[model samples]
Target chain A: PLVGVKRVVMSLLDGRGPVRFVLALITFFKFTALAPTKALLGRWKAVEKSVAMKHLTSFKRELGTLIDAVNKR
Target chain B: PLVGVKRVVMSLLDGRGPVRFVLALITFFKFTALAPTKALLGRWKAVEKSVAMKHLTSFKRELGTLIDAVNKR
Candidate 1:
C-alpha cells in the first residue's frame, strides 16, 4: 500500500542525491518496501548503507535458511 | 552509480502524470528530446528536485550552502 507509493516516489528521486547516499536509499527502500512504508521510513535516517546492506545480506541468508528448513521436512 | 536506472524508470512511471513540470532547458544539443521525456528519461531529476525544493523552503539556505562557498578573505 503505502510502501508501494514510497517505492515509487523514492525511485523517482533515487539518482538525485550524492551517488553513494542515493545508493543506500535505493537498497533500503527496496527491501523495506517488502514490509511496510511506516516501518521503512521510520528507520531510514538511522540506518546507514552498510547497515542496510548487512540486513539485506542477512535477509538472503535467512531466506536460504527458511528454504532449507522447509525442504528438510 | 546511475541511481539504479533512475529507480527503475521512475518505477515504470509512477502514477503517470499531471505531475508538475521540469524547469525549462535551452540545451545546446540539437537532439534534445522534449521536456517530459528528458526529465523522466534521465531516470530521476535529482539536482532539479533538490534545488527547487530548497528554493521553495529558503532557496539560499538550501542551494547557497551547497553551491557556494565562504568568501575569500
Candidate 2:
C-alpha cells in the first residue's frame, strides 16, 4: 500500500548523517527521468560501459528489495 | 565514485517497465525533499501513525542497503 506511493515519489531524500543517504536510492523512469541509468553508473566511454551496466543492474535489484520490504509493510 | 553521483542527482530516472521502479526508491532529505516522509506514510492523524513510522524505518533501511551496493560498484 505505502510502497505504492514510494514508487511514485521515486526519490524524496532521507536520513541526516554519515550517509544522510537514501539506499535510500537512485532513480528510474521517464525520459528526462532516464538520465541516471545512462549516466550515474560510470563512463560515457565504451569499454567502461559493461561495468556501468553491472552497477545499474545490481543497484536496481537492491532497490527492489527495499520496495518489497515497504510494500509488505 | 558512481554512487556519489547517485546521491547528488538523488534520482535521474531509468527503465521503461514495471517497477520501472527506482527499488527502485523514495526520498529522504531537504525541506522540499522531506515531503515523502510525512506525506508518503499514512496518517497525519495520531494513532495510525505508529504504523507509518515502521514503514518509513524499514524502507529507509532497505534503501540504505541499495545505496551501499551501488557505492561499492
Candidate 3:
C-alpha cells in the first residue's frame, strides 16, 4: 500500500490536525527566491553521495572508492 | 508513465521473490530509534548535496562557478 506518501499529501490538503501550512508556504517562497548557499549546498551533496555509497557498500569492489577518497587518507 | 517505482514497490510486496523486508525494517529502526552514525549521516548528506548541485547546474553564469565548491575538497 502506498500509505505514507499518499496520506501525507492528502493530510496537507484536506485533513488538518497540526499542520505547518504557513511554514510550508514560507519555505516555498524562500526556496524559489533564493538559491542555497554554498555551505548548504555542500550538505545536500553529502546526502546524495550517501545514497550512492549505500548502493556501493554491498559490492566488494566499490566505484566510489575509486572516484573519490571518502576515507581519511 | 510511473512504471519503475510502481513496479518495484509492487514486486516487493506481491511478486513472491526473496525480498529483504527484514533489512528494510531494520533500517527504519536504525534511522528512527538511534541517531545515524557519523559515517551514515555523511552519506545521506552527500546525496542531498548532489541533488541541490544538480538544480544549480541548470542555471549558468560566471559567478555560478562557485557552486562547484559544494563537493569535497
Best by lDDT: 2
> Relative to the true structure, how large is the alpha-carbon lDDT of every model?
0.33, 0.35, 0.29
Model 2 interface DockQ: 0.07
**Worst-scoring 10-residue span by lDDT in model 3 chain B:** B17-26
Candidate DockQ scores, in order: 0.03, 0.07, 0.05
State the displacement of the C-alpha of residue A73, model 2, in Å, after optimal TM-score superposition. 1.0
Greater TM-score among 2 and 3 belongs to 2
lDDT of candidate 3 over A1-73, digit per residue (tens): 3454333322333323222221221122232343333433333334454443332232212222322332322
TM-score of the first chain of model 2: 0.38
lDDT of 2 by residue, A10-72 (tens): 333222222112212233222113344433222222223345445545544554554455456
Docking class of 3: incorrect
Query: Which candidate has the highest TM-score of all?
Result: 2
- Residue A66 displacement (Å), model 1: 1.1
Task: Give per-model TM-scores.
Answer: 0.25, 0.27, 0.21
Error of 3 at A52 (Å): 13
How far out, in Å, is residue B62 in model 2?
A: 20
In candidate 1, stretches whose alpha carbon ends up further than 4 angstroms from where it belongs are: A1-40, B1-73
lDDT of 2 by residue, B1-73 (tens): 3354343332323222222122222322221233444422222223233454454445445545544554565
Off by over 4 Å in 2: A1-47, B1-73
DockQ, structure candidate 1: 0.03
lDDT computed for candidate 1: 0.33
